[PDB]
């Protein structure tokens, strides 16, 4: 930050720390800053730490390190400035305040595993086909490799492919005899893939979640479950989805929607509406079909973010000490069904750490059954879709479909100022190039969703404001996250 | 709720349980914001800590101890915080006592009562004398002048609505002259609702709308070309932009959402900016009723904010300010520019003397606004206040009243504030009132000016009290606490 020695007289040193938000107009990940604390080092004796405009923040000294807390003052909107004055009595080899480190109210060691990248040879504007594909052999390799990923894809099955295992379910889903995973339309798969590349969220998990919450991504041969007749490979199936539900296929309540709307200003514009973004229709042209998955993912992501803000490094520590290989998925799903308050009540990272890290099956030992066996159902369907090597979902995409998709993305997400008109148009030109380039493999009439859409997405994301995942901020966020004691 | 956990030796350990008891939503109990908790003792405070780890900030001034929760001071539904206090026994009264929770709201906020129904009034079956205290004053035409700005401290008449449709002999939005008139009667119903509910002078809302969007004023000036309005065989031009989504009060969506978050008791979650604010040429549009109230709320919010930041001193200023229109100036200026402008002026802080000594507040502080906003609004308000010649009046059928209250139920409040039984019986009492004081006019209509305050009060005999809820929530706490005017 910006500090300055105001005066050194006698043995006391007076330093002015200017903490401020510089931005006047909205910028990416700079609309509002939330500061948990400000740490600095000194060997001298701290006399007093006060605000310049009256009052003093709460601080405490542990050896060489001093931690300053802003408490209720820690909210920095646009064009906000707070000056802090520090007095120190000169002592030791290094008495002057130094090594200032502002700790934002966010997971300092949060983990978002990279799925894959474009070749370093890739350039904006005019690129070649070899600048899109690192290795055509693996890029078109059909062979399906099994994986055991839950909510977050730490270890991707393939860096450039989309493995959505449309597996058959041999165990009860919503009290059914059996079930079969299928995708309603391709635009929803585009949404799943966008959430996958952007937020590193396993699409199979969103499939399981939607299927459990509203039969959104699953059908069954069970006669009791009567609904829309879906034909797959000369086989009649019943789709008991409630397509008229305003909470969408992910069952997102309006309260949660508005809350995560306030949490992420960089993602959700002010004109956003619950029913518009979530409630889908039988018509695949509905915008919601694309917006519904991402939003859900965001919500899920939010929960994770929250934990990273409350537990910090310890979170990651748990990940290497937990015997249950599905623990994170369990916690996140359970928190999605019940609420973050349920997670806070479980107190895994607090009072009940030992039982948590020692239990081989986390969701059984904590009696977190959810609503009608929610957690185990979601986990099981996710794992089953992960193990599927026989049949993987694929789709054909025309250019107008891509245009439609990105137009929808521009219309429903982001905020004026994040991406101006120029480089967005240029972005669409680069996506045009990419499309026409790797469509020559299929005959220039279509591109493969599974094989190509990750590449398309990455080409499109070469222009997206980085860091790609913005920090959840704002008023509500600060105090809902700071009060969080899991 | 405090309790002596243990007294051992000379140290006393007390457990203070601070919590929100409500699980389902209730009126003015959805969220509690606590600035501080004060208690008295003569002993020596050893330590004040939270039960779940950490300690709040406190300080002792003699017998009084002030506890501050800071970032912990937000209490949503079903939230509980336990605080442990240790005190060393000393003096005549050592035990913690006289606990006083100071909510983050004006402790001495002033909302002057305009008038009341007779104490003889009962729910269900009442008489005509239970509605009218004195028929003489109740139907007295004679118009008494007044000098009220934003808040009606001294009402001209307790049961009447004096909307002075006066002629303006000075420039409003660069016009040669202007004439105040009401678009439709439903908007007047809205103005009156804001008047009885939030104690806001309807003339002020008239001036505000007129200045912001020509919403309540017409002119004979030829340059100002627009919709032709005929009043008493006289052609007038109405240069209102009826297609503006910000409504006739020019309320930006940001402000709308902010005050939407500030008042959970007033605005439901499904509320939309364009739906509530943007009106149309058709008087049947719901916005025509919702637009004034909302605006008033916004205005009220500003005032509330000051009451939270300055407290008693606010009222003190009211009796020390030489300018009799100071509050109106500050509120209007804050509405045009923003509360940040008021915070920047620092009247109650660094520049108190010049503020209370200046006879004309808005001239000495150079707060001209946008194109002379403040003085225009003040002048139009005062002119409408001085008007005794011609007062606005309207005729109301029962279906109009039904429409009004249905709109109110649909657009405002929150599920749980007023149950169905409560509303249905209320509407029956309003039916009774209507039919009762319609017998004076022939049972075909009721007078807006003379009767609608009575109707409103009859309807408000069932409304959840206190009628004006406290602005609360996350945004409110820290936007109000950071406020240093
Ligand atoms: Co604990
Ligand atoms: Co083909
Ligand atoms: Co990138
Ligand atoms: Co804020
Ligand atoms: Co000051
Ligand atoms: Co009452
Ligand atoms: Co909150």
From TrEMBL, chain A:
EC number(s) stated in the UniProt entry for this protein: 3.2.1.14
GO biological process: carbohydrate metabolic process
Recorded GO MF terms: endochitinase activity; polysaccharide binding
UniProt keyword list: Glycosidase, Hydrolase
Superkingdom to which the source organism belongs: Archaea
Enzyme category, top tier: hydrolase
Name of the molecule in the record: Chitinase
Organism whose genome encodes this protein: Thermococcus chitonophagus
Residues of the full protein shown: 321 to 805 of 805
């Amino acid at each position: 930050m910006a500090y300055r020695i105001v005066s050194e007289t006698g043995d006391k040193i007076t330093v002015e720390l200017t903490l401020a938000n510089k931005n006047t107009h909205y910028v990416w990940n700079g609309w509002c800053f939330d500061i948990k604390n400000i740490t600095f080092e000194t060997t001298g004796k701290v006399l007093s730490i006060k605000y310049a405009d009256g009052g003093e923040p709460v601080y405490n000294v542990n050896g060489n390190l001093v931690t300053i807390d802003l408490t209720w003052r820690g909210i920095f909107h646009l064009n906000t400035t707070v000056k802090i004055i520090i007095e120190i009595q000169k002592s030791g080899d290094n008495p002057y305040p130094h090594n200032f480190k502002i700790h934002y109210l966010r997971g300092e060691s949060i983990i978002y595993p990279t799925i894959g990248e474009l070749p370093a040879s890739w350039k904006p504007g005019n690129f070649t086909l070899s600048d899109l594909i690192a290795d055509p052999k693996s890029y078109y390799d059909p062979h399906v490799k099994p994986h055991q990923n839950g909510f977050i894809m730490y270890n991707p099955p393939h860096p450039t492919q989309i493995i959505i295992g449309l597996a058959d379910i041999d165990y009860p889903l919503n009290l059914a005899s059996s079930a079969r995973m299928w995708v309603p339309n391709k635009y929803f798969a585009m949404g799943l893939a966008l959430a996958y590349e952007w937020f590193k969220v396993n699409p199979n998990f969103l499939m399981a979640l939607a299927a459990k919450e509203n039969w959104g991504t699953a059908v069954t041969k069970d006669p009791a479950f009567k609904g829309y007749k879906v034909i797959i490979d000369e086989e009649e199936y019943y789709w008991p989805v409630q397509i008229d539900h305003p909470d969408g296929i992910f069952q997102v309540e309006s309260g949660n929607f508005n809350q995560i709307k306030a949490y992420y200003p960089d993602i959700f514009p002010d004109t956003a509406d619950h029913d518009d973004y979530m409630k889908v229709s039988l018509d695949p042209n509905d915008t919601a079909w694309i917006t519904s998955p991402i939003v859900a993912a965001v919500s899920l992501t939010m929960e994770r973010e929250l934990l990273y803000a409350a537990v910090g490094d310890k979170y990651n520590e748990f990940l290497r000490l937990a015997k249950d290989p599905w623990a994170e998925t369990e916690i996140i799903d359970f928190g999605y069904n019940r609420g973050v308050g349920a997670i806070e009540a479980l107190k895994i990272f607090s009072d009940n750490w030992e039982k948590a890290i020692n239990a081989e099956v986390l969701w059984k030992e904590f009696n977190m059954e959810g609503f009608g066996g929610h957690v185990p159902t979601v986990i099981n369907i996710t794992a089953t879709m992960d193990m599927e090597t026989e049949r993987i979902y694929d789709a054909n995409l025309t250019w107008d479909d891509i245009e439609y998709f990105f137009t929808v993305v521009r219309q429903k997400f982001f905020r004026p100022g994040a991406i101006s008109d120029e480089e967005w148009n240029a972005m669409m030109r680069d996506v045009k190039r990419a499309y026409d380039l790797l469509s020559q493999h299929w005959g220039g009439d279509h591109i493969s969703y599974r094989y190509d859409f990750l590449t398309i997405l990455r080409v499109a994301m070469k222009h997206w404001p980085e860091p790609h995942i913005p920090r959840p901020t704002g008023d509500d966020w600060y105090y809902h996250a700071r009060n969080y004691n899991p």
